Amino acid sequence: MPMQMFMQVYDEIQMFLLEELELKFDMDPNRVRYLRKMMDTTCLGGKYNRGLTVIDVAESLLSDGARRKRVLHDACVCGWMIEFLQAHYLVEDDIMDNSVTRRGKPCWYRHPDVTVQCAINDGLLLKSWTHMMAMHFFADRPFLQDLLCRFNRVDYTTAVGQLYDVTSMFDSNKLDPDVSQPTTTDFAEFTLSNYKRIVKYKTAYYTYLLPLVMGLIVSEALPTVDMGVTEELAMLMGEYFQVQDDVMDCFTPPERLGKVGTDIQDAKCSWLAVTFLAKASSAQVAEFKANYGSGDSEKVATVRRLYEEADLQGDYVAYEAAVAEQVKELIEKLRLCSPGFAASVETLWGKTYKRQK
Amino acid sequence: MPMQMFMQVYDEIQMFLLEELELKFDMDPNRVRYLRKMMDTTCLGGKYNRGLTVIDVAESLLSLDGARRKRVLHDACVCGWMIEFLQAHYLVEDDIMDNSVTRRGKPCWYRHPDVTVQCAINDGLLLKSWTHMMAMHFFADRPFLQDLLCRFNRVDYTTAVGQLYDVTSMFDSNKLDPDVSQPTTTDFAEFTLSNYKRIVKYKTAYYTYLLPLVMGLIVSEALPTVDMGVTEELAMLMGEYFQVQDDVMDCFTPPERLGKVGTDIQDAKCSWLAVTFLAKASSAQVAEFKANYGSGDSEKVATVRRLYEEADLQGDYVAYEAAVAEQVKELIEKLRLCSPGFAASVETLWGKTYKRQK
Numbered sequence: 001m002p003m004q005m006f007m008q009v010y011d012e013i014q015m016f017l018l019e020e021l022e023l024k025f026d027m028d029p030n031r032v033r034y035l036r037k038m039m040d041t042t043c044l045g046g047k048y049n050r051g052l053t054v055i056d057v058a059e060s061l062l063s064d065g066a067r068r069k070r071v072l073h074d075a076c077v078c079g080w081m082i083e084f085l086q087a088h089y090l091v092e093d094d095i096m097d098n099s100v101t102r103r104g105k106p107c108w109y110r111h112p113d114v115t116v117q118c119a120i121n122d123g124l125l126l127k128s129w130t131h132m133m134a135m136h137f138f139a140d141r142p143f144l145q146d147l148l149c150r151f152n153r154v155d156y157t158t159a160v161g162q163l164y165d166v167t168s169m170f171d172s173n174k175l176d177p178d179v180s181q182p183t184t185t186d187f188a189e190f191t192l193s194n195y196k197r198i199v200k201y202k203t204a205y206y207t208y209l210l211p212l213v214m215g216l217i218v219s220e221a222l223p224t225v226d227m228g229v230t231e232e233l234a235m236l237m238g239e240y241f242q243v244q245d246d247v248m249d250c251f252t253p254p255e256r257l258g259k260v261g262t263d264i265q266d267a268k269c270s271w272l273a274v275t276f277l278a279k280a281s282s283a284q285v286a287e288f289k290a291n292y293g294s295g296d297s298e299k300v301a302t303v304r305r306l307y308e309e310a311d312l313q314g315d316y317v318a319y320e321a322a323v324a325e326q327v328k329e330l331i332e333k334l335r336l337c338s339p340g341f342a343a344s345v346e347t348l349w350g351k352t353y354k355r356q357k
Numbered sequence: 358m359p360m361q362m363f364m365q366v367y368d369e370i371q372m373f374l375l376e377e378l379e380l381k382f383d384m385d386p387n388r389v390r391y392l393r394k395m396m397d398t399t400c401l402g403g404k405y406n407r408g409l410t411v412i413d414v415a416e417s418l419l420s421l422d423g424a425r426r427k428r429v430l431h432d433a434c435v436c437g438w439m440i441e442f443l444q445a446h447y448l449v450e451d452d453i454m455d456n457s458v459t460r461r462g463k464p465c466w467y468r469h470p471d472v473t474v475q476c477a478i479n480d481g482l483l484l485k486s487w488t489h490m491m492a493m494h495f496f497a498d499r500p501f502l503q504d505l506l507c508r509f510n511r512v513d514y515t516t517a518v519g520q521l522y523d524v525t526s527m528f529d530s531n532k533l534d535p536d537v538s539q540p541t542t543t544d545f546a547e548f549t550l551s552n553y554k555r556i557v558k559y560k561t562a563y564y565t566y567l568l569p570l571v572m573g574l575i576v577s578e579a580l581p582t583v584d585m586g587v588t589e590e591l592a593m594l595m596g597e598y599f600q601v602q603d604d605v606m607d608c609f610t611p612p613e614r615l616g617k618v619g620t621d622i623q624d625a626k627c628s629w630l631a632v633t634f635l636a637k638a639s640s641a642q643v644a645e646f647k648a649n650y651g652s653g654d655s656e657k658v659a660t661v662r663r664l665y666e667e668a669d670l671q672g673d674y675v676a677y678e679a680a681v682a683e684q685v686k687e688l689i690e691k692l693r694l695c696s697p698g699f700a701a702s703v704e705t706l707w708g709k710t711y712k713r714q715k
């Protein structure tokens with residue numbers, strides 16, 4: 001039922017925004033139709049993990065009848081805030097990554113009647129909607145300020161991780177806006193240390209810490225959990241989640257994934273890249289430097305081939321195990337003083353551990 | 358003084374942001390050097406009208422204590438950059454959307470040598486985040502904080518809305534449908550003055566004229582002291598005028614002065630010139646228009662320039678400028694009545710606008 005009560009609030013939100021545009025920004029039906037379409041296409045079709053997580057946390061920590069109602073509603077609004085937030089970032093990211101499809105559909109900036117210049121702004125509109133909806137729905141909620149403050153923080157950190165991502169293939173020593181530079185040749189920066197930094201900031205926060213946090217804020221139970229642990233967890237699961245993202249972008253068929261991979265082509269500092277490099281021989285690495293970051297598909301097949309022949313699947317399974325170990329412990333360590341939360345966190349994990357997509 | 362105090366705060370702001378990243382965002386010195394450069398390039402070199410307007414207003418009110426003055430003036434500086442940083446965010450993104458080549462004497466951000474088009478997009482995002490980061494850090498204990506952010510974001514929102522009206526102004530809006538592809542309008546039935554006035558109102562008037570005046574009133578804590586109604590008419594009127602000026606320069610002002618190269622004609626933009634010409638152009642002229650508008654072809658572009666001359670647009674301009682200079686004068690006097698200090702600051706801003714050179 002949460003999925004349907006969530007979609008229910010979506011209509012509620014879409015109605016407000018769209019009608020507000022027609023009534024106070026004197027927008028035309030044509031463009032109202034466009035934004036409705038834009039909204040549904042960029043915000044729907046995902047796994048809704050972030051949004052559904054918020055609702056779960058809220059529900060779980062429920063401890064009147066009108067309250068439960070209000071709370072669950074507030075959760076739905078927050079969920080869409082995060083959902084609208086990822087929407088804003090996927091739009092821009094696909095433009096930044098030159099991706100082809102998203103959620104079994106052409107990337108927004110790829111749709112025929114959508115131009116790149118407009119997609120960039122359509123993305124901007126998404127980010128404003130996160131505020132417009134929070135303000136309108138939480139105008140009276142005392143937790144409004146704190147909520148937005150945290151939201152912008154996470155948003156800001158994600159934009160920082162993105163910077164790390166989109167520049168990992170450039171020797172930072174030479175990184176000078178005034179002087180042009182080619183993709184790194186030595187890859188001397190493709191380290192797990194550097195990899196851990198990208199992932200932590202570009203994904204962990206908004207994908208894991210934020211949904212959890214927003215649930216505690218709307219349930220007004222924030223001060224009841226061991227944040228220090230809760231974050232450790234979020235940082236951990238987030239890293240994992242992103243490592244999966246990387247692996248699928250290389251080995252999970254789009255028909256299944258919903259998106260065509262671009263890392264190898266984009267010369268990204270992925271999990272596969274840093275792991276391979278750290279364990280590969282000079283011969284293997286020379287070949288890598290000869291086929292990585294190339295659109296040419298037979299070269300991508302070379303890279304893909306190289307990874308398989310270095311047993312990355314072994315490293316992966318090993319990593320995934322070490323993670324499951326710590327996650328298990330931290331959740332218990334958390335369950336002690338926060339049974340309900342620990343439970344929702346454990347749930348969020350179920351949606352994570354060995355996901356297919 | 359104004360500029361020196363403004364620049365003073367800038368370095369202070371650049372110091373907080375860049376250091377927070379270093380210490381709390383696990384950032385390296387290389388990427389900190391970059392962001393500092395990105396900040397100085399995207400936020401500096403402009404005319405600083407929006408920013409300095411906050412300060413001017415703030416001061417004009419100072420006298421409605423030596424410590425207050427020091428705080429009100431500082432808060433005005435912070436809000437001043439919030440707008441400059443927001444202006445910077447939209448300029449980076451717009452230069453991409455408009456495929457422009459130069460900005461403030463240098464190449465557009467996304468056209469800098471070590472700045473890739475996709476990174477520039479994100480750098481733009483960083484620009485907008487900073488506005489929030491600086492406000493939250495300097496105004497944490499200010500009671501006006503919420504109201505302040507609320508107003509800022511709505512204006513941020515409206516601008517993005519104006520951007521939508523501008524970026525799709527050359528497309529048959531009835532065909533607007535993500536699924537189906539479509540070409541540039543060929544009949545131009547939408548290049549109307551009403552449509553032009555809407556684009557400008559939202560994409561510019563608010564963040565270039567209303568916001569600066571409001572932020573100043575807020576940090577002055579004089580917001581309720583002025584006729585908001587009149588204040589809005591002024592902003593909307595001055596805002597539209599400022600944009601019309603922007604469009605005219607886009608086509609006739611030399612890049613050398615303007616600081617940027619024009620792209621409206623080649624971008625098939627619904628500019629003030631296009632709508633005015635179309636409104637007074639004879640069939641013969643309109644047809645030659647449709648055949649030379651919307652192409653990078655240097656020769657075609659030179660034709661549109663000539664066509665505008667032929668229609669005596671400068672004549673249309675002088676008139677518009679006059680009618681606007683008219684009402685602006687009146688409205689300021691309505692203000693002066695209940696708000697002399699604010700009306701004065703408004704006049705200053707109008708001084709920075711009227712017959713601007715760039």
Ligand SMILES: O=P(O)(O)C(O)(C[n+]1cccc(F)c1)P(=O)(O)O
Binds near residue numbers: 097162165245
């Ligand atoms: O699966 P993708 O490619 O959409 C990705 O995970 C999206 N994404 C992830 C994190 C932050 C972001 F702004 C965007 P990537 O980082 O581009 O690989």
Ligand SMILES: O=P(O)(O)C(O)(C[n+]1cccc(F)c1)P(=O)(O)O
Binds near residue numbers: 560
């Ligand atoms: O001189 P330009 O071309 O940079 C412009 O005035 C910028 N600009 C103006 C208003 C809003 C905006 F986001 C961006 P234009 O509208 O693209 O002509």
Ligand SMILES: CC(C)CCOP(=O)(O)OP(=O)(O)O
Binds near residue numbers: 046047
């Ligand atoms: C953060 C990240 C890996 C981006 C993709 O996130 P996701 O796979 O959860 O996104 P959706 O399920 O919303 O499309």
Ligand SMILES: CC(C)CCOP(=O)(O)OP(=O)(O)O
Binds near residue numbers: 600
């Ligand atoms: C017309 C417009 C809002 C964009 C250019 O604004 P502006 O000329 O005030 O910008 P700068 O002086 O900041 O470069």
Ligand SMILES: [Mg+2]
Binds near residue numbers: 093097165
């Ligand atoms: Mg990415």
Ligand SMILES: [Mg+2]
Binds near residue numbers: 093094097099
């Ligand atoms: Mg991507």
Ligand SMILES: [Mg+2]
Binds near residue numbers: 245246249
């Ligand atoms: Mg990916």
Ligand SMILES: [Mg+2]
Binds near residue numbers: 451452455457
């Ligand atoms: Mg432009």
Ligand SMILES: [Mg+2]
Binds near residue numbers: 451455523
């Ligand atoms: Mg534009």
Ligand SMILES: [Mg+2]
Binds near residue numbers: 603607
């Ligand atoms: Mg212009």
